[PDB]
Design a protein around this ligand. Structure first.
Ligand SMILES: CCCCCCCCCCCCCCCCCC(=O)OC[C@H](COP(=O)(O)OCCN)OC(=O)CCCCCCCCCCCCCCCCC
Ligand SMILES: CCCCCCCCCCCC(=O)OC[C@H](COP(=O)(O)OCC[N+](C)(C)C)OC(=O)CCCCCCCCCCC
Ligand SMILES: CCCCCCCCCCCC(=O)OC[C@H](COP(=O)(O)OCC[N+](C)(C)C)OC(=O)CCCCCCCCCCC
Ligand SMILES: CCCCCCCCCCCC(=O)OC[C@H](COP(=O)(O)OCC[N+](C)(C)C)OC(=O)CCCCCCCCCCC
Ligand code: SF4
Ligand code: SF4
Lengths: 123, 233, 63, 121, 61, 190, 181, 239
C-alpha cells in the first residue's frame, strides 16, 4: 500500500501549540467546505447550515483543552473522521449518529426535577 | 493433544479413499494445467518479486511462488513431520500460474503424507498422559476419586498455564499462520492475537494489482485465497 | 471500413461465373489493396489497450 | 565512480525480480572496500559494531579474492547466490553509512522506569 | 494397555499413486496435419467436380 | 571449515543455479509440428474429451428426505435430557454443563425438592447461541444431557428455539431408543 | 516410480465389467483411471454405530505413566517445571562483562567481591565504560566469536536443501515449478 | 483384474502390541543448547547497539529485545540490514495493555529471517497519548498491522500514511481491545421503523453477561519453576 487514499494525511505530531492551531483551523475549513457534498451524499432531510452548526458545535466541545498531546490525538481523530465522511465510506445510518437530537422527539415526560426523575427512578 | 481416539475402521477407509483420489486429481489437472485459456488468463498476472515478497510479509504459496525455498514443516518442523518423508514445490516466476502449480503439487505431497501416516501409525495414548491438563476417561472418573476431582476442576475452572508469552507459527495451506498468546498465569489468556496469512495477503493487494486490467483483479484474489475469517476476525 | 469491404465482395461472388479470369484479377487487386491497409493496422499495434505499469526494468546502480 | 548491485532485467534466475548480474566480483570487491573505508573512517575503534563488521567484510573479501569460479565462492560465502551477496554487501554499506549519523556506541538516552517491564512474576 | 483400537496392517498397505499420471496421448502433429490436408483435398476434389457438373447441367437447360 | 558470520551450513544447494531458458532455435519441435498444435487446439480438445468422458458416468446425488447421508454416533444435533431406567430425570444440577459452555447457552436454577434429592428447578438452552461443541455432553458425570443426531428441527420463530426443561425432557424421551445406539458405540471412546 | 501409475484393479472403485471395459480401454485418455464411486460392500461396512471393535475397546496408556506403584506425579510433572524468561538489563550484562561468569569467574577476594558486585548493582560503572575497560580476548571470547566474527542468527534445526531435478521430480523440464525436497 | 475380485482389507492380520513403551522426558530439555546459542547472540546485539537496547529476554527458543520508542527505527534498520541479522520479513505487530504501568501499552514486533531461519521480537512502550514511530518507512507490509494496532489499542505510529480505523464500525467511538472497554460494549443496533433506518442505541441485553472468572483458584497453581540460563550467562558467586 505505497499509494495512499485521496484525502489522506501522514500522521504527524506537533511540538508547538500554534502550528496545531493552524492545522485545526485548516481542518475546520475542510469540514465546512465539505458540508454541501455531505448533504447531497447522505440524502439528508434538513439543510446544510445544520451540518455547519454541528461542525462548529463539535469543535466548541474541545476548546479549553490545554495539554498539547491530547490536542494532537484529538486532531488525528478529527482528520480520520473527515476522511471517512468525505470519501463516502460511512453510510447514512452512521452519518446520522451525529444527529440523535434532530430526527424525532422521543416522547413526553422528560424528567427535569428530582421528583419526575424519582417517579420513574431515572428509568 | 487430541479430543478422542479414532473410530474402529477409519484407517482402512482413508486408504480406500486415497487410491482413487490420486486419479480424481489428475483429471482436474488436465482441463486446467495445459488449457490455453487458463494459461493466458494467469501467466504474467500477479507477479511478485522475491525481495518484496519478504517486505510485504507474504508466506506459504505466495512466497514459494517467487522462488524462495521456505516452508515451516521442513524448516522449523513440528508434530511428526520429521518422521514423514515428502518434498516441496516452489515456483520460479512470481505469477498466478506458478502459485497454481505449487498447489497442484502440494495435493500430491499431502497424499504422500496420508499414505505414509496410515502405514506408520503406532499404538498408544492419544491424549497427554496426566489428568491435570486434560480430562480422565469416563471409565475412570466414575470410580476414581482423584479422577472425579480432576474432571470437576478442569471444566469449571480449567487448567492454569504458567506465566509467559509465545508466538507459535505453523504452515496453514493459506500460508504461515501464527498465534501470539500472553499467559497471565491465570486460567484465561491475558491476551491472544491471531496472525492470519490472508491479512498480509490482502494488505499486499495494492502493491501487486497496480496496472492490471479489471478482469485480472479477480484472478489475483483467487491466488491469495481470501476466506475473510482470516482477514477480519 | 472492413464491413464495407465485406459487402463489396457480395456483388462479386454473385457474378463470379460471368467475369471469369478477368473480374477474378480485379477482385485480387481489390483484396490486396485492402490487405495492405490491414497490415498497416496490425503493424501499428492499434487495437491494443496496453498496461501502464511495468516491473520498472531500470537497474540498481549506486553512488 | 558508480557500481551495479542488482540487475532488474536480463538472464533469468531462480528468484523473481533478480536476474543474472554481469561481472559480480569487481562490484563485490569495490563494495567491500567502500564498506571498510567508510567504517574505519567514521566509527570509533573501541566499538564492538565496528570491530565485527571489519572482521566480517575482511573475511568475505578474503574469500572472494582467493577463489576464482563463482559457485566455489557462493558455497564458501554461505549466503545465497552472488546476486544476493552483492545486494547484502550494498545493504551493509548503507547501514554502516547510517550508523555514523545515528552514533549507537553512546550510552542509552532513554532509561526505562521500573514499573516498566514486569510480567506477572 | 492398548485393546480395541484402530491399528494398521501387519505389513502395511500397498502404495497408492501420488505421481502425475498425464501420459502423452495422440498421434504426432504432422500426422494430424497430413490427415487434415488429405480430408480437405478430397473434399475439394468432390466440390470442384460437382461445380463443373452443375455448369454442364446449366449448359443443357 | 569455519564459516563467515552471516553464514551457516545453509549454503545454496548443488544445482540452485537455473539453466538459461532455451531460444526458439534450440528446440526439438519443428515449426510445423508446434503450430499444428497451435491452430488445431490440441490440448483444448484433450480437456474437452475429459468432460465428455464424465458425461457417461454415475452421478453422486442422493435424494435428501428419501435418503440421508452419513452418520457417525459422535455426531451432534439438538439437545436432550435423558432419564434413568424406571424414569428419573438424571440431572443432579451440578452446573458443569453451564460452567464449561463456550457460548453461555446454558442457564440453570437448582433447588432441593421434596424428596431431599438435588434436581434442577429450571433448565434452559438458547439454541440461537449454541455452537454444538459437545462440551456440555463431555462434562456431565451422570451423562444427563446428550446431543441427538437430529438436525431436522428448523423453526419459524425465535421463541420456539428457546428450549426449557420440558422440551428437552420431551426430546430425551423421544430419542431415547436412538441414543441407546449412539452411546453403545461411543461410551468406550469417550 | 515408487508412487507411479498403478492399474485400476487396485483402486477400490466400481469401475466396469464385461465388454464395456474393452470398449472403455479403447475410449480413454489413461486406461488406469477410476470412475470415482467407492465399492459399496467394501467402503463403510459395517456402519460406525455397529462395530464389534467398540465392545472390546479399553483406554490406552504408556508404561511409565499408567504404572500403578513406582511413579510419583512430581517426577513426571512438567507443567510446574517450566523455565522462566531470563530477563537481562544492561547492568547485569555489565556485571557479566566485568565480574565474569559462573563458568568463567574473574573474581578473587570473595569478601570484597560482594562489594565489587555492589557498585555495579548500584550503577557505578556504565556499559560502554565496561566495553572500553574489558580486554580484547574477553571481547573476542564472550561478546564475539573466537575468530572475531559476529555470531550468526541462530536456528534450532538447520535445513540443507537438495533440489530433485531428474524424473523423480514432480514436473518435467519445461514447467516453471521445481521440486526442492 | 476386476472390481469383483479385489481383496478386502478389513479381513487382515493387523498390528497388535501387548503394551506401549513411551519414555518420559522434559520438553524443555531439547531446546537448551540452542537457548545457550540464543543467549550469546543476544549478548552480542546489546554490545553492538548500547545506545538503543535496554534489555533482552530469552525464555525458551525465543528472543525478545527490549527497546525504547525513539529507539525503534535505528534498531529495526539494524535488524533488516546487518548480514548477521537480515530480519527481512515483518510477521506480526500488535499491542498489549498493562493498565498498572505508567506507559500503558507495550508494542511488540515479530520478525522472520528466512535466510538464517530465525525469529526475533522487539518490544517498545507507549502511553495512550504518546506515539511510537512507524516502521512503514522500511516495511511496506507493516502499515496494515500498525493500523490494526491503532484501532484495537489506540497506539499511534508517527509518520504513517493513512492511519485510520480498520475492522471496526465507522462511527465507532472506543478502542475495543482495552481493559476499560467492556465486553459487550456501549451501543447496539436495531431497525427503527419510524425513521426507516437502523438506529444506534445505548446497550441493553435480554440475558446479562455472566463471567465465571470470579471463582478462580485460591491456591497458586504453578511453582516458580527451574532455569535454563546457562552457567556462562549468570553472575559468579564470589569465592
Ligand atoms: C498447421 C495447421 C494448419 C495451417 C493452416 C493455418 C490455419 C488453418 C486452420 C485454421 C483453424 C483455426 C482455428 C482457430 C485458431 C485458434 C488459434 C489460437 O490458438 O488462438 C491463440 C489465441 C492467443 O494467441 P497467443 O497469445 O499467441 O497464445 C497461444 C498459446 N500458444 O488464443 C486465444 O485468444 C483464445 C483461444 C480460443 C480458442 C477457442 C476457445 C473456445 C472454442 C472451442 C471450440 C471447440 C470446438 C469443438 C466442438 C466439437 C464438436 C463435436
Ligand atoms: C463426428 C465427427 C467428428 C469426429 C471427431 C474428430 C475425429 C477424431 C480425431 C481425434 C481422435 C483420434 O483419432 O486420435 C487418435 C489417437 C491415437 O493415439 P495413440 O496412438 O493411442 O497414443 C498412444 C499414447 N500412449 C502410448 C501413451 C498410449 O487418440 C485416441 O485414440 C484416443 C481416443 C480418441 C477417441 C475419439 C473421440 C470420439 C469418441 C467416439 C469414437 C468415434
Ligand atoms: C464427440 C467426439 C469428441 C472428440 C473429442 C476430441 C478427442 C481429442 C483426443 C486428444 C487429442 C490428442 O491427444 O492429440 C495429440 C496431438 C499432440 O500430441 P503431442 O502432445 O505433441 O505428443 C507428441 C509425442 N507423441 C505423439 C508420440 C505422443 O495433438 C495434435 O497435434 C493435433 C490434435 C488436434 C485434433 C483435433 C481434431 C479436430 C480437428 C478439427 C479441425
Ligand atoms: C493452391 C493449391 C493448389 C493445390 C494443387 C493440388 C494438385 C492436385 C491435382 C489433381 C488433379 C485432379 O485429379 O482433378 C480432378 C478433379 C475433378 O475433375 P473432373 O470433374 O473429374 O474432370 C473432368 C474433365 N473433363 C470435363 C474434361 C471430363 O478436379 C479438381 O479440381 C480437384 C483437384 C484435386 C484436389 C485439389 C485440392 C486443392 C485444394 C486447395 C486448397 C488450398
Ligand atoms: S445436565 Fe449434566 S452437567 Fe448439566 S446440570 Fe445436569 S448433570 Fe450437571
Ligand atoms: S453443545 Fe456446546 S454450546 Fe451447546 S450447550 Fe453444549 S457446551 Fe454449550
Amino acid at each position: 500500500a505505497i499509494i495512499a487514499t485521496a484525502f489522506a494525511e501522514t500522521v504527524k505530531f506537533s511540538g508547538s501549540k500554534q502550528e496545531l492551531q493552524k492545522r485545526t483551523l485548516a481542518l475546520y475549513r475542510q469540514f465546512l467546505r465539505g458540508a454541501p457534498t455531505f448533504a447531497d451524499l447522505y440524502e439528508v432531510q434538513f439543510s446544510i447550515p445544520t451540518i455547519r452548526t454541528k461542525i462548529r458545535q463539535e469543535f466548541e466541545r474541545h476548546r479549553f483543552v490545554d495539554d498539547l498531546s491530547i490536542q494532537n490525538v484529538l486532531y488525528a481523530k478529527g482528520h480520520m473522521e473527515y476522511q471517512e465522511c468525505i470519501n463516502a465510506w460511512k453510510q447514512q445510518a452512521q452519518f446520522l449518529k451525529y444527529f440523535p437530537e434532530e430526527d424525532d422527539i422521543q416522547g413526553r415526560h422528560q424528567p427535569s426535577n428530582f421528583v419526575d426523575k424519582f417517579l420513574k427512578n431515572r428509568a | 493433544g487430541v479430543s478422542q481416539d479414532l473410530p474402529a475402521g477409519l484407517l482402512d477407509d482413508i486408504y480406500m479413499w486415497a487410491t482413487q483420489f490420486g486419479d480424481r486429481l489428475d483429471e482436474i489437472e488436465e482441463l486446467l494445467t495445459d488449457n490455453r485459456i487458463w494459461k493466458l488468463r494467469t501467466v504474467n498476472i500477479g507477479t511478485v518479486t522475491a525481495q518484496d515478497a519478504l517486505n510485504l510479509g507474504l508466506s506459504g504459496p505466495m512466497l514459494r511462488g517467487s522462488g524462495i525455498p521456505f516452508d515451516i514443516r521442513k524448516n522449523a518442523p513440528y508434530d511428526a513431520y520429521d518422521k514423514v518423508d515428502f518434498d516441496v514445490p516452489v515456483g520460479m516466476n512470481g505469477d498466478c500460474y506458478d502459485r497454481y502449480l505449487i498447489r497442484m503439487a502440494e495435493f500430491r505431497q499431502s497424499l504422500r503424507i496420508i499414505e505414509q501416516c496410515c502405514n506408520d501409525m503406532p499404538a498408544g495414548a492419544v491424549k497427554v498422559e496426566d489428568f491435570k491438563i486434560n480430562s480422565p476417561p469416563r471409565n475412570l472418573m466414575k470410580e476414581d476419586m482423584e479422577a472425579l476431582i480432576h474432571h470437576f476442576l478442569l471444566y469449571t475452572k480449567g487448567y492454569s498455564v504458567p506465566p509467559g508469552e509465545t508466538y507459535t507459527a505453523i504452515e496453514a495451506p493459506k500460508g504461515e499462520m501464527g498465534v501470539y498468546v500472553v499467559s497471565d498465569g491465570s486460567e484465561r489468556p491475558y491476551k491472544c492475537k491471531i496472525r492470519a496469512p490472508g491479512f498480509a495477503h490482502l494488505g499486499a493487494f495494492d502493491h501487486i494489482a497496480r496496472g492490471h486490467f479489471l478482469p485480472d483483479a479477480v484472478a489475483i484474489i483467487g491466488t491469495m485465497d481470501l476466506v475473510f475469517g482470516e482477514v477480519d476476525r | 471500413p472492413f464491413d464495407l469491404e465485406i459487402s463489396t465482395l457480395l456483388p462479386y461472388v454473385m457474378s463470379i461465373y460471368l467475369v471469369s479470369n478477368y473480374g477474378f484479377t480485379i477482385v485480387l487487386l481489390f483484396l490486396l489493396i485492402l490487405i495492405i491497409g490491414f497490415v498497416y493496422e496490425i503493424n501499428t499495434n492499434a487495437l491494443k489497450i496496453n498496461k501502464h505499469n511495468k516491473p520498472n526494468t531500470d537497474s540498481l546502480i549506486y553512488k | 565512480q558508480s557500481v551495479l548491485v542488482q540487475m532488474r532485467e536480463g538472464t533469468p534466475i531462480g528468484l523473481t525480480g533478480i536476474y543474472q548480474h554481469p561481472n559480480p566480483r569487481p562490484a563485490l570487491i569495490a563494495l567491500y572496500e567502500a564498506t571498510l573505508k567508510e567504517l574505519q573512517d567514521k566509527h570509533p575503534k573501541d566499538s564492538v559494531y565496528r570491530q565485527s563488521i571489519e572482521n566480517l567484510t575482511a573475511h568475505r573479501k578474503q574469500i572472494v579474492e582467493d577463489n576464482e569460479v563463482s559457485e566455489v565462492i557462493e558455497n564458501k560465502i554461505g549466503a545465497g547466490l552472488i546476486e544476493e551477496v552483492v545486494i547484502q554487501a550494498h545493504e551493509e554499506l548503507e547501514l554502516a553509512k547510517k550508523m555514523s549519523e545515528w552514533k549507537p556506541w553512546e550510552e542509552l538516552e532513554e532509561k526505562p522506569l521500573e514499573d516498566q517491564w514486569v510480567y506477572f512474576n | 494397555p492398548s485393546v480395541g483400537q484402530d491399528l494398521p496392517p501387519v505389513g502395511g498397505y500397498e502404495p497408492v499413486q501420488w505421481r502425475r499420471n498425464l501420459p502423452a496421448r495422440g498421434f504426432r502433429p504432422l500426422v494430424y496435419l497430413a490427415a487434415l490436408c488429405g480430408i480437405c483435398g478430397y473434399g475439394f476434389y468432390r466440390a470442384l467436380g460437382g461445380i463443373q457438373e452443375r455448369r454442364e447441367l446449366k449448359r443443357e437447360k | 571449515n569455519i564459516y563467515a558470520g552471516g553464514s551457516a551450513a545453509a549454503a545454496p544447494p548443488a544445482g540452485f543455479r537455473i539453466h538459461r531458458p532455451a531460444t526458439w532455435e534450440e528446440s526439438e519441435e519443428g515449426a510445423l509440428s508446434k503450430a499444428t498444435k497451435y491452430f488445431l487446439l490440441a490440448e483444448m480438445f484433450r480437456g474437452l474429451y475429459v468432460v465428455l468422458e464424465q458425461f457417461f458416468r454415475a452421478p453422486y446425488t442422493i435424494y435428501y428426505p428419501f435418503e440421508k447421508g452419513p452418520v457417525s454416533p459422535r455426531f451432534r444435533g439438538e439437545h436432550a435430557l435423558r432419564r434413568y431406567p424406571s424414569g428419573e430425570e438424571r440431572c443432579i444440577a451440578c452446573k458443569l454443563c453451564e460452567a464449561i459452555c463456550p457460548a453461555l447457552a446454558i442457564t440453570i436454577d437448582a433447588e432441593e425438592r421434596i424428596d431431599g434429592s438435588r434436581r434442577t428447578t429450571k433448565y434452559d438452552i438458547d439454541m440461537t447461541k449454541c455452537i454444538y461443541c459437545g462440551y456440555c455432553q463431555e462434562s456431565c458425570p451422570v451423562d444427563a444431557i446428550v446431543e441427538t443426531p437430529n438436525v431436522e428441527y428448523a423453526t419459524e420463530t425465535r421463541e420456539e428455539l428457546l428450549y426449557n426443561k420440558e422440551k428437552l425432557l420431551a426430546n430425551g424421551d423421544k430419542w431415547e431408543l436412538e441414543l441407546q445406539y449412539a452411546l453403545d458405540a461411543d461410551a468406550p471412546y469417550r | 516410480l515408487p508412487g507411479g501409475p498403478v492399474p485400476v484393479f487396485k483402486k477400490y472403485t466400481v469401475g466396469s465389467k464385461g465388454i464395456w471395459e474393452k470398449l472403455r480401454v479403447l475410449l480413454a485418455i489413461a486406461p488406469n483411471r477410476s470412475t470415482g464411486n467407492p465399492i459399496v460392500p467394501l467402503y463403510r461396512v459395517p456402519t460406525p454405530g455397529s462395530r464389534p471393535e467398540a465392545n472390546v475397546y479399553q483406554d490406552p496408556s504408556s508404561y511409565p505413566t499408567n504404572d500403578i506403584a513406582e511413579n510419583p506425579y512430581w517426577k513426571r510433572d512438567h507443567r510446574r517445571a517450566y523455565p522462566q524468561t531470563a530477563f537481562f538489563d544492561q547492568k547485569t550484562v555489565t556485571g557479566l562483562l566485568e565480574l565474569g561468569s559462573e563458568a568463567t569467574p574473574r573474581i578473587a577476594d570473595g569478601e570484597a567481591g560482594t562489594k565489587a558486585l555492589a557498585n555495579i548493582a548500584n550503577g557505578g560503572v556504565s556499559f560502554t565504560q565496561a566495553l572500553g575497560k574489558s580486554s580484547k580476548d574477553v571481547i573476542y571470547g564472550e561478546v564475539l566469536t573466537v575468530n572475531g566474527l559476529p555470531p550468526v542468527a541462530p536456528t534450532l534445526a538447520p535445513k540443507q536443501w537438495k533440489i530433485i531435478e531428474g524424473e523423480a521430480a514432480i514436473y518435467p523440464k519445461g514447467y516453471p515449478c521445481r521440486t526442492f525436497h | 483384474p476386476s472390481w469383483e475380485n479385489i481383496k478386502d482389507i478389513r479381513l487382515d492380520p493387523k498390528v497388535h502390541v501387548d503394551e506401549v513403551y513411551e519414555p518420559i522426558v522434559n520438553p524443555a530439555d531439547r531446546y537448551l543448547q540452542h537457548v545457550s546459542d540464543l543467549h550469546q547472540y543476544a549478548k552480542y546485539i546489546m554490545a553492538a547497539l548500547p545506545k538503543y537496547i535496554q534489555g533482552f529476554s530469552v525464555w525458551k527458543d525465543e528472543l525478545t529485545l527490549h527497546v525504547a520508542p525513539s529507539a525503534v527505527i535505528p534498531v529495526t534498520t539494524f535488524l533488516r540490514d546487518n548480514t548477521s541479522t537480515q530480519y527481512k520479513s515483518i510477521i506480526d505487530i500488535t499491542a498489549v495493555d498493562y493498565p498498572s504501568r505508567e506507559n500503558r501499552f507495550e508494542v511488540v514486533y515479530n520478525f522472520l529471517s528466512v535466510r538464517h531461519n530465525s525469529r526475533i521480537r522487539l518490544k517498545t512502550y507507549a502511553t495512550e497519548v504518546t506515539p511510537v514511530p512507524s516502521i512503514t518507512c522500511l516495511y511496506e507490509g507493516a502499515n496494515w498491522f500498525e493500523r490494526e494496532a491503532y484501532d484495537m489499542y489506540g497506539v499511534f505510529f508517527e509518520g504513517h500514511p493513512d492511519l485510520r480505523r480498520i475492522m471496526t464500525d465507522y462511527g465507532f467511538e472506543g478502542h475495543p481491545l482495552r481493559k476499560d472497554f467492556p465486553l459487550t460494549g456501549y451501543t447496539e443496533v436495531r431497525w427503527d421503523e419510524e425513521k426507516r433506518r437502523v438506529v444506534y442505541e445505548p446497550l441493553e441485553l435480554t440475558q446479562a453477561f455472566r463471567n465465571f472468572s470470579a471463582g478462580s483458584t485460591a491456591w497458586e497453581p504453578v511453582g516458580p519453576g527451574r532455569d535454563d540460563r546457562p552457567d556462562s550467562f549468570k553472575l559468579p558467586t564470589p569465592k
